[PDB]
Amino acid sequence: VSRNDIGPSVVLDPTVKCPTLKQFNLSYNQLSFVPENLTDVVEKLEQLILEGNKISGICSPLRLKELKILNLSKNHISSLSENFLEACPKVESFSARMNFLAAMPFLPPSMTILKLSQNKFSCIPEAILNLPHLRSLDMSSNDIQYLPGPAHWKSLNLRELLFSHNQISILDLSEKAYLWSRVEKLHLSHNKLKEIPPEIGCLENLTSLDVSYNLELRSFPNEMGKLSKIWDLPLDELHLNFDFKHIGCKAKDIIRFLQQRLKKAV
């Protein structure tokens, strides 16, 4: 039941017990709360999608022991309660885009995907750097000042990082850059990046690297030429010192060119 004008609050009657409902889509309605009595009634819920509604701010903790995908994107939330997700130990995906979120509370350690974009984070929360298995992460269009180096992140299966449109100055990869060896997408477009670190060649499994629209960026380091698996390397509005006007725009050509300059440069 989505895109209807349901509202302003859904109250499921406690006398009804529906243990077979393994999905619930209440998106794009005019809800102003989470659906109440959702734990006693919809016992085994998998995907609770409440996108697009105008939800003010959560106060009652979900208790769905079997939740797997939550989705509260495009809402009016500004702060999530400090124990609102503690009683759902199976959460993997959690989307909270386009809110006014500023702090992230305690999360279950099973969370694999976590897409918090466009939603006012001044800095990466400390509660998300300790996620044991955090495959994907998207925090685009926030105001992020400094992302920590690969030593601070607890995860080991980091496979996609999105941080475009942030106020990031210095990408740090000095200490233990091999921990990110599984990263398959790293976006840093529309930032204040100054220089790609020479240790970037250690991320031997990159398939895309978007450092476009970085005016302060000047030249690519030679060591980048070892990222043999890269197939996308956008260069739009990138005033490069090193001339590749003879090479063109093919990403594989850029990588091979840098790879030859590794051996010798005259």
User: In the 3-class helix/strand/coil scheme, how is 119-157 assigned residue by residue?
Assistant: CCCCCCCCCCCCCCCCCEEECCCCCCCCCCCCCCCCCCC
> Torsions phi, psi of 84, nearest 5?
-80, -25
Residue type, 9: S
Structure determined by: cryo-EM
Torsional sign, CA 138, 143, 148, 152: negative
Give the CA dihedral 19, 25, 31, 33, nearest 10 degrees. 50
- Say if CB 70 and CB 48 are below 8 A apart: yes
Q: How far apart are alpha carbons 58 and 78 in whole angstroms?
A: 9
Question: 76 near 56, Cβ under 8 Å?
Answer: yes
3-state SS assignment for residue 163:
coil
> Residue 206 in contact with residue 181, Cβ under 8 Å?
no
Q: How many other CB atoms are found less than 10 A from the CB of residue 70?
A: 22
Give dist(CA 40, CA 19) in Å, integer.
9
DSSP symbol at 232? B
Rounded Cα–Cα distance for residues 53 and 30 (Å):
5
Residue 68: C-alpha distances to residues 71, 85, 108, 120, 258 (Å) = 10, 12, 11, 25, 44
Rounded Cα gap, residues 178 and 51, in angstroms: 37
Within 13 A of 248's CA, how many CA atoms are on the CB side? 6
